[PDB]
Design a protein around this ligand. Structure first.
Ligand SMILES: Nc1ncnc2c1ncn2[C@@H]1O[C@H](COP(=O)(O)OP(=O)(O)O)[C@@H](O)[C@H]1O
Ligand SMILES: Nc1ncnc2c1ncn2[C@@H]1O[C@H](COP(=O)(O)OP(=O)(O)O)[C@@H](O)[C@H]1O
Ligand SMILES: Nc1ncnc2c1ncn2[C@@H]1O[C@H](COP(=O)(O)OP(=O)(O)O)[C@@H](O)[C@H]1O
Ligand SMILES: Nc1ncnc2c1ncn2[C@@H]1O[C@H](COP(=O)(O)OP(=O)(O)O)[C@@H](O)[C@H]1O
Lengths: 51, 436, 435, 445, 443
C-alpha cells in the first residue's frame, strides 16, 4: 500500500518516531505533527486504523 | 580550495579591464601592455560569446615581456567550468601517441559539454540504528532514526540498505548522505557532540538539488572507445583513439544540442612556446582550425625569424606562412622603468617581502639594466639575507649582497669569456691544471 | 546559437542541372572552372562504377581547395562516406604508415544495412522458468500502461536476466533481435515495500510493450575489419573498464581483408547490403613521405579503392623523404601521372569583397558600406584570411560601444590591435632582441 | 566478388598461343610482344615448379605495363597458386624487422596442397537425449538427425556427448558431423523453429534446413602457405595472429622444423608443394639490408620466383650514398634476368584506350578516340585513360549517350596534365609556397 | 672500517648563525661566496614559501658543484626530499622525456601524513565458512560468509567476514593458530606468523613465532607516513592495494612508465590540499638536482621553462661545466653553459671559483685523513705540486694506490718514493695524450 501523509493526504515521505504520524514536508512537521496535543495522534491514525 | 602558496604568475587575477574593454594602468596584478591586454580582452569576449570556433591567436614579443602573463590573465578572467588546456611545445612528442593524435587530444580537451541533471539526496544526522539479525542472517529487520535540525523521521530498511549500512559503519550521531538510487552512503563526519566534525544539516531531508557537469569531448572520446575504459583519463594510455569514435561523438553531441539536453562550452587551448612544433604539427593545426568542435587556440612564441623545426628554411616566429595566414597576432612590447618598478612592487607584495624605497630603486635599476626576471628573483633571495641578520625590511645593501652573490646573464657571460680555458668549449678542450 | 568556423557558408557547389557554375550560388563566389570540375567528379562518385579515381586540386594558399572538398562532401550528402584527413595524420607511432593509409582507404568505403529494431519493455509481472537442472524455456510476462504481453524465451536470455538480477516488478528492456537485456529499475507499485531502499524506482512506461522500428545501419569496411581483428578478443556490450592488456593497432593482413570482402559480397548478393563507395580526402598531401607516396601507387590500383582527393599549395618543391627529386606540388611524377589536376585560381578585389560580405552575413554581423571596401582593400593588401578573421574583433568592438554596425573606426581599431604576418615580420626584422 | 572497375581489370591473362607466341591484342593485353613472351617463359617456369629462387626484374619507363604484365601473369596463373603482390614500402614495419617482413612475404608465396575426405552428416536434430547413467563414467546416446527428405538414427559415443554438451544443441538446430574426422559444428537454428522462442538472443542464427541426402561425401582441397604454418605453430592460438598480423618475429628453429616436416609430408605423400610468385612492386624503395637479404634468401630450396618491377633510372640506392642502375645494387642485378618494356606508339595507345573504354562501358566516337589518342601521344597514356571516364560523366550531364569530341575537349580544359600544370606553376611561382617557404598571399601591394 | 667514495668528507656547508662561511669547516675548503649563496638558497628552501626557484652552479671541472649540491642536501636533512639526477637520465625508452621530467618534479615534493589505521589483529582460533545455497549459479561467490575467531591479549572477538576479505585472508595462507593482521583501510591481510602458545620445534618451514598481540582485537592506530606526490600519482595510475580484480591484476602485470595526465595530478593535488586543510598533512617542498645540465636537449629545456612557472614546482639546482657550447638538438645557437637564454633569464647563476695550491694541499690532507692514510709533509708537498701540475682529481685518486704501495712495503706512512712510484705506474690525461700523439699504431 502507498504511504500518504496523515495530516494533508499528500505523499508521505517521512514518519515521526514519537507519535508515529506520517507527514509530507518540514513545515507540516514543525507546525502540526510535533506540537500536537496527546490523543490527537490516536484519532489521526483512526482514519487508516493504526491505533 | 586547491592551495599552492606562491607561483610566478600567482599575482595575476585576470585581465584588468573595465566594462568598455579598456585596460586600467594597474588592475588585477597586471600593469602595462595596454594594446595587448585590450586585444586579449577581445579574444576573451570571443571565447565568452561562444559563437565562433577555430580562431588562431598568436602572442609574440621579446622574452620576459607579458606573454604567459597575458594567457594567465585570460585563464583567470575566463572563470571556471570553461576548459583551459595549457600545454607546451615539447609536450606532444609522445612515445605511444603520434603528434597529430596528441594534438587532437589537446584540441578536444578544450571543448566542454554542459549537462544539468537532478538528483535525490538524503542528508541528516543519525539518531539511532537498530538492526535485528537472525542466526543465518538471510532476513533482517531495520530501523533508522535520522534527523535534521528541522525534522525527525524513522525509516524501515530493506536487506540491501542494512547491508550498505553495516558496510561503511554508521553509528549514532554520524552525519551521512544517502543516494537512494546508487546506494552510495558517504559519511560527512560526526555532529557537534563532545561526548572530523561537521555541522548538522538543516531544512528538508529528502532533497532535490541540481548538479552541473562539464565534461570535455576527450573524456567522451575515451569512454566511448571500447578498447580502453575511463581509467585512461588518469593512466594516460589512451593510445590513438580512432576517428570513427570521434565522428560518433560529434554526431551525438550535435544530437544533444538540438534537443536541449546539453550545451556547448568552448574554451581556450594555450600552446605555450609554439615554435617547438614541427611542420607536420603546424599543418595539422592549419587543418584542425576549420572544424566545428575546435577551441580558440592561443599560441605564444618569442622567436624572431627562426628556423622551423622539421624543415631547412627560416620563417618568422618559427612558424610557416600558411599558419600565420590563419592567425591574428598580438604583439607585446618591452617595459619602461615605471612598469618594471610596478611589477617589482607587485611581486614583492605577493611574496610578503617588505621593501625600502632605495632597495626598490636599486632593483628597478638592475631590472632595466639586466632583466626583469632577474630582479624578480632577487627579491625572495635577498629577503633571506634580510632575516639572516635579524631584520624585517629589505634594505639596499641586502639587494647589493644578493647582486654580488648571484650572477645574471651578462656577468656570467663576461666571466666565462675572461676565463675561457677553465670551461669546456664546443671542441671539448679544457684545462684543469692551475699551473702553467 | 550557431557556431561558424571558417566554413558553413559553403552549402554545396551551387551548380544547375547542366553542371554550370553560377557566379554566386551556395555560398561560393567565383571559381567557375574548379567548381564545374568538382561537379564532374561528384557525378563520377555518384555513378558508383569506378575505383581508385584520384584527383588533386592545387593552387595558392587561401584560394578554396578545402572549400571545394567540403562542397563535394556536401553535394554527396551524409549517406556517402567522406574521410577528411591531413597528410601528417598518416605518421602513427603504433603501426606503420602504409597500414594507416590502407585503413583510411577502407574507411571511405561504406555499407547500408536495412535492419529491424524490436523492443519489449515493461514491468515484469511473471518470471517462471521451465526445466528439462537445465532450463528449457522461460515464460516472461511484461506489463505497460497499454496492456501486457507474455513471451517465451530461450535460456540465454535467462542467463542475461540472471546477470541483470531481474526480479518480479523490475521494469526491464528486451531487444528481440539481439537479445540485449537492460534493467531500468523497479516500478512505483513496489516503491513502498520499504521506507528506505537501495533500489531505484522508475514509472510504468506509457507506451506499448511491443515496439517495432525500421532503421538504417551505416557501417564502413574498416569498421568490419576492426571488429573482425580484435587482437585480444571481444568485449561485452556494457563494460565501463577496459581490458587489462592494452590493445594497440596491428598490421591487419590481406587475408582478413579478403575474407571481409567475401562476406560483404555474399551479403550484397542476397540484397541485404548496399555498397556505397566514398571519398578519401587527404589535405596537405605534400608532406607525405616518399614511402607513403609509393604505396599510394599500389593502393590506387586496387579493386575496392575509393575516390581519392588531394590538396596541395606547393610549387616547385622537393618531395619529403628525398633529397633532389624536384616535382610539382610536392607530389612525385609517377603519382602525378595517375591524377587529374584541377587548378585553383586566386581572387580579385570584387570576389574578396563578396566573400567578406558573405562571411559577415553568415556571422550575423551588419557591416557598413564604407567599412566593407576598406576590409576588401585590407584583404587585397595583406591576405583574404586576415580580412575574414578580423570580422569577429570588429563585431565585438562594435558591440562594446553599444552598436550593431561595423563603423570604419572599429575596423581601424581592429587593424591596430591585431597584426597580419607582413607587419609582424616587419616588426621582427627591425628589432634587436627576439622581437 | 567485390570488385569495381580497377586500373587494370580488363587484363585476364597474357594473350599467348600454345607456342608462347603473343597475339597482338588478346586477353586485354596490347603489344609488348617481347615482354609478354618473356612473361610467358616465366609463367612456364612457375607452372613447372622445379626451378626455385629466380629473380626477375621487369624494368621500364612509367606508364608502360610492368604491373600490367604482373597482373597478366597473376591472372594467367589461375587459382590455388600463391601470388603475393606487395609494394616496396610495405616491409618498413614497426612491429617486425625488414628481414622478418621480407621472409614473411617470401613464405606467403609458396604453399602445400592438402586433399582430405569429408563424410558430412548435415541436418537438423529431431531430439537428443542425455542418458545420465548411475555410474556416470560413460554416456551413450541416440542421435535423431533429419533432413527435409529422410531421417536416420545414429548411435553416439561419449566424446560426441561432451562435445555436443559444449556448443549445446537444443533439439531443432542445424548441425553437421563428420564421420571419420569427428568434427562438430553448430550452423544455427532451423527456420521451422523461427517463431518458437519470441526473441533470438546474441549467439544464435537462423539457417535453412538442409535437403537431399543426409550423408554427403565431398573431397575438399586445401592450399596452405608456409607462412600459415609458421603463424599457427608460433603460438597456442595462432590463427588470431594469422588474421590480425600480430605474428611478431617468428624464430628460425620452428621455421627449420616446419621445413623438415613439409619435406617429410612431401616424401610421405600427405601433401605436395605448390610454388608461386612473389611480386615486389616498386622494388627500388628498399634498403640495402633488404637487398642483401633478398640476394641471400633466393638460394633457399623453399623459395618462390620473385618478380620485381621498377621505373627508376640511374638512381640512388636507399640507405647508401651512391647511384645505381634501376635503384638496385650490382650484386642483386647479377642474380637477375631483366625484362625490358618498350614505349608505345599511336596504334597501341589507340587500342589500349579502346579496350579501357569498353571495360568502363563508355562509348566513344571515332574522332573522339582520335583526339584521345593524340592526347595520349602528347601527354601520357593514363591522362587520356582518366579523360575517357570524366568525358563520359560530361556526356551523361549533357543528356547524351556517346562521348564526342566536345566532351573530350571540355575534359581537357577542366582537368590538367603534368606539363600544363608545371607550366602554370612556373608562370605564377610567386603564388605558391616554394622550397624555402616563401609565398605571396596578397594579390595587390 | 667504513666506505668512502669521492665524497662523505663533506657534512655540510659549514656556516655560522650569521650565514658567513668559515675557511675550513664541514670538510669544505674555500669557495666562501658559493657556500654563502648555497646557504641563502638553503634558507629559502627551509622557508617553504617558494615554487620554481631555480639556480645554476657554474664553474670548471673539479671545482665543487656536485659537492655544493650534496652539502645542500646534507644541510637540509633527511626529512626534505632530495632528488639527485643526471641530464642523460631523462632520456627513457618507455615514456617521453617530458613525462620523466614531470615525474622527477613530483618526486621532489613530499609531505608528512598522520594516517589512522583501523586494525583487526589476533590469533586465529576458528575458521568456519558458510556455503551458499547454489554455488553453480554463475554469479555470486561459492561461500556466503566466513566466521573468523580472533583472540588477542586481554580480549577476544569473532568476525563474520565478507568473501572479498576472505580472498585476502586465504592468499596469505592463513590457518588455525596463526597470528594475523587485518588492515581495514585496504582490506590487506598480513600473516604475522605461527602463535607461540602451541609447540614450536615441530615445524619444517622456518616460520616466525610471534606472541599474542596486546590490547583489543579492534584497534585504531595513528601512523606518521612520508610520501611524495609522485608516489600518489603512480599509486593512482597503477592501482594496487584494493581487493578488486583490477588491483590484483595490477600487481601481476609488468610495471611500465605511463604518461600521467594533468587531470590525475590535479585530482591528487586537490586531495592533498584537502588533507592539509583537515590538518593531518604538512607539505614539505624539496630539491631537484640535475647534474650535467648541458646534456638536456631543447625539448626538455622548453618544458623546464614551462614547468618552472607551476605553483607546485620544487627548488631546482643545476650544474654545468661548459663555457659557450651549442645546445643539444639545435645547430646554430651559442649559449652560456649549454643553457638557452630563456632558461638563463629565470635562473640565478652561482659561480664556483678554482683553487690555489694551498687549498689543493689541504684538500689532499683532509681526504687522506678521511681515507685513514698517514702522509708526511714532503710527500704532501709533492702531492700538492703534482695536483697543481696535472689536476686535483688525479692527485685525489692517487692517494689509495700510494697507501697500497706503502702497505706492500710493510709501512704505515706514505713517503716520496710511494708518490713517485704511483706517478710512474699510473698516468693522467695529459701524459697519456702525449703518449697518444707520439705513436704510429693507434693507441
Ligand atoms: N603586465 C604584467 N603584470 C605583471 N607581471 C608581468 C607583466 N608582464 C610580465 N610580467 C612578469 O614577467 C614574467 C615573464 O612572463 P611573460 O613575459 O608573460 O612570459 P614569457 O617570459 O614566457 O614571455 C612573469 O613572471 C610575470 O610575472
Ligand atoms: N569562392 C569562395 N566563396 C566563399 N568563400 C571562399 C571561396 N573561396 C575560398 N573561400 C574561403 O577562403 C578560405 C580558404 O581557406 P581554405 O580553402 O581552407 O585553404 P586553401 O584555399 O589554401 O585550400 C576558406 O575559409 C573559405 O571559407
Ligand atoms: N600492354 C598493355 N595492354 C593493356 N593495357 C596496358 C598495357 N600497358 C599498360 N596498360 C595500361 O596502362 C595503365 C598504366 O600502366 P601501368 O601498368 O600502370 O604502367 P607501369 O607498369 O609503368 O606502372 C594500366 O591501367 C594498364 O592497364
Ligand atoms: N671546497 C672544497 N673543499 C673540499 N673538497 C672539495 C672542495 N671542492 C671540491 N672538493 C672535492 O673535489 C671533488 C670535485 O668533484 P665534484 O665536485 O663532484 O665535481 P665538480 O667540481 O665538477 O662539481 C669532490 O670529490 C670533492 O670532494
Amino acid at each position: 500500500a502507498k504511504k500518504y501523509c496523515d495530516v494533508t493526504g499528500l505523499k508521505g515521505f517521512y514518519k515521526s518516531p514519537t507519535n508515529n504520524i506520517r507527514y509530507h514536508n518540514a513545515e507540516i512537521y514543525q507546525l502540526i505533527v510535533k506540537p500536537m496535543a496527546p490523543g490527537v495522534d490516536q484519532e489521526y491514525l483512526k482514519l487508516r486504523g493504526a491505533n | 580550495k586547491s592551495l599552492s602558496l606562491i607561483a610566478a604568475h600567482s599575482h595575476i587575477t585576470g585581465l584588468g579591464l573595465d566594462e568598455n574593454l579598456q585596460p586600467r594602468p594597474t588592475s588585477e596584478g597586471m600593469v602595462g601592455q595596454l594594446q595587448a591586454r585590450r586585444a586579449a580582452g577581445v579574444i576573451l569576449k570571443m571565447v565568452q560569446n561562444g559563437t565562433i570556433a577555430g580562431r588562431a591567436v598568436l602572442v609574440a614579443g621579446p622574452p620576459s615581456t607579458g606573454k604567459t602573463a597575458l594567457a594567465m590573465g585570460v585563464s583567470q578572467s575566463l572563470g571556471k567550468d570553461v576548459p583551459f588546456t595549457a600545454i607546451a611545445g615539447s609536450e606532444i612528442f609522445s612515445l605511444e601517441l603520434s603528434k597529430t593524435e596528441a594534438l587532437t587530444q589537446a584540441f578536444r580537451k578544450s571543448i566542454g559539454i554542459k549537462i544539468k541533471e537532478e538528483t535525490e539526496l538524503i542528508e541528516g544526522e543519525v539518531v539511532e540504528i537498530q538492526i535485528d539479525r537472525s542466526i543465518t542472517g538471510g532476513h533482517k529487520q531495520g530501523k533508522l532514526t535520522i534527523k535534521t535540525t528541522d525534522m525527525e523521521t524513522i525509516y524501515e530498511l530493506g536487506n540491501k540498505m542494512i547491508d550498505g549500512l553495516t558496510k561503511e559503519k554508521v553509528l549514532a550521531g554520524d552525519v551521512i548522505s544517502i543516494d537512494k538510487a546508487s546506494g552510495k552512503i558517504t559519511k560527512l563526519g560526526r555532529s557537534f557532540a563532545r561526548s572530523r566534525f561537521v555541522q548538522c544539516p538543516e531544512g528538508e531531508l529528502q532533497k532535490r538539488k541540481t548538479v552541473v557537469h562539464t565534461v570535455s569531448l576527450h573524456e567522451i572520446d575515451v569512454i566511448n572507445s571500447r578498447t580502453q575504459g575511463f581509467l585512461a583519463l588518469f593512466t594516460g594510455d589512451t593510445g590513438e583513439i580512432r576517428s570513427e569514435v570521434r565522428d560518433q561523438i560529434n554526431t551525438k553531441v550535435a544530437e544533444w544540442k538540438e534537443e536541449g539536453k546539453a550545451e556547448i562550452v568552448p574554451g581556450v587551448l594555450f600552446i605555450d612556446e609554439v615554435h617547438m612544433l614541427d611542420i607536420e604539427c603546424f599543418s595539422f593545426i592549419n587543418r584542425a582550425l576549420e572544424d566545428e568542435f575546435a577551441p580558440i587556440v592561443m599560441m605564444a612564441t618569442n622567436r624572431g625569424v627562426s628556423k622551423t623545426r622539421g624543415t631547412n628554411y627560416k620563417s618568422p616566429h618559427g612558424l610557416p606562412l600558411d599558419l600565420l595566414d590563419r592567425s591574428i597576432i598580438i604583439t607585446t612590447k618591452s617595459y619602461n622603468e615605471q612598469e618594471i618598478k610596478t611589477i617589482l612592487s607587485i611581486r614583492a607584495q605577493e611574496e610578503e617581502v617588505e621593501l625600502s624605497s632605495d632597495a626598490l630603486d636599486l632593483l628597478t635599476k638592475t631590472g632595466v639594466e639586466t632583466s626583469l626576471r632577474y630582479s624578480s628573483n632577487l627579491i625572495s633571495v635577498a629577503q633571506q639575507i634580510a632575516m639572516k641578520r635579524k631584520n624585517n625590511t629589505v634594505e639596499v645593501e641586502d639587494v647589493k649582497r644578493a647582486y654580488l652573490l648571484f650572477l645574471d646573464s651578462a656577468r656570467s657571460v663576461k666571466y666565462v669569456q675572461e676565463n675561457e680555458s677553465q670551461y669546456i668549449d664546443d671542441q671539448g678542450n679544457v684545462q684543469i691544471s692551475i699551473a702553467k | 546559437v550557431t557556431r561558424t568556423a571558417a566554413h558553413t557558408h559553403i552549402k554545396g557547389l551551387g551548380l544547375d542541372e547542366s553542371g554550370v557554375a553560377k557566379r554566386v550560388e551556395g555560398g561560393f563566389v567565383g571559381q567557375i572552372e574548379a567548381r564545374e570540375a568538382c561537379g564532374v567528379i561528384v557525378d563520377l562518385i555518384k555513378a558508383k562504377k569506378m575505383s581508385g579515381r584520384a584527383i588533386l586540386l592545387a593552387g595558392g594558399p587561401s584560394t578554396g581547395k578545402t572549400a571545394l572538398a567540403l562542397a563535394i562532401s556536401q553535394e554527396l550528402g551524409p549517406k556517402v562516406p567522406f574521410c577528411p584527413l591531413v597528410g601528417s595524420e598518416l605518421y602513427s607511432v603504433e603501426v606503420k604508415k602504409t597500414e594507416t593509409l590502407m585503413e583510411n582507404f577502407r574507411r571511405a568505403i561504406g555499407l547500408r544495412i536495412k535492419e529491424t529494431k524490436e523492443v519489449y519493455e515493461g514491468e515484469v509481472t511473471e518470471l517462471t522458468p521451465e526445466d528439462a537442472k537445465t532450463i528449457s524455456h522461460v515464460i516472461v510476462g511484461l506489463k505497460s500502461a497499454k496492456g501486457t504481453k507474455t513471451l517465451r524465451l530461450d535460456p540465454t536470455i535467462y542467463e542475461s536476466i540472471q546477470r541483470e538480477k531481474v526480479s518480479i516488478g523490475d521494469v526491464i528492456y528486451i531487444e528481440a533481435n539481439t537479445g540485449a537485456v537492460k534493467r531500468v529499475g523497479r516500478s512505483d507499485a513496489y516503491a513502498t515495500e520499504f521506507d528506505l531502499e537501495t533500489e531505484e524506482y522508475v514509472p510504468l512506461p506509457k507506451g506499448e510493450v511491443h515496439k517495432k522500428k525500421e532503421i538504417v545501419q551505416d557501417v564502413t569496411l574498416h569498421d568490419l575489419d576492426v571488429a573482425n581483428a580484435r587482437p585480444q578478443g571481444g568485449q561485452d556490450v556494457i563494460s565501463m573498464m577496459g581490458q587489462l592488456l592494452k590493445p594497440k593497432k596491428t598490421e591487419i593482413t590481406e587475408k582478413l581483408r579478403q575474407e571481409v570482402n567475401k562476406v560483404v559480397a555474399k551479403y550484397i548478393d542476397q540484397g541485404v547490403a548496399e555498397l556505397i563507395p566514398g571519398v578519401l580526402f587527404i589535405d596537405e598531401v605534400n608532406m607525405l613521405d616518399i614511402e607513403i607516396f609509393t604505396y599510394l601507387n599500389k593502393a590506387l590500383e586496387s579493386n575496392i579503392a575509393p575516390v581519392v582527393v588531394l590538396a596541395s599549395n606547393r610549387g616547385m618543391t622537393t618531395v619529403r623523404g628525398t633529397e633532389d627529386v624536384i616535382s610539382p606540388h610536392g607530389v612525385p611524377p609517377d603519382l602525378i601521372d595517375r591524377l587529374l589536376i584541377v587548378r585553383t585560381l586566386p581572387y580579385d578585389k570584387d570576389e574578396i569583397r563578396t566573400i567578406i560580405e558573405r562571411r559577415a552575413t553568415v556571422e550575423r554581423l551588419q557591416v557598413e558600406s564604407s567599412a566593407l571596401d576598406l576590409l576588401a582593400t585590407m584583404g587585397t593588401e595583406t591576405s583574404l584570411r586576415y580580412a575574414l578573421q578580423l570580422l569577429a574583433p570588429c563585431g565585438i568592438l562594435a558591440q562594446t560601444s553599444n552598436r550593431k554596425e561595423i563603423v570604419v573606426n572599429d575596423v581601424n581599431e581592429a587593424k591596430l590591435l591585431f597584426l597580419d604576418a607582413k607587419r609582424s615580420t616587419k616588426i621582427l626584422e627591425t628589432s634587436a632582441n627576439y622581437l
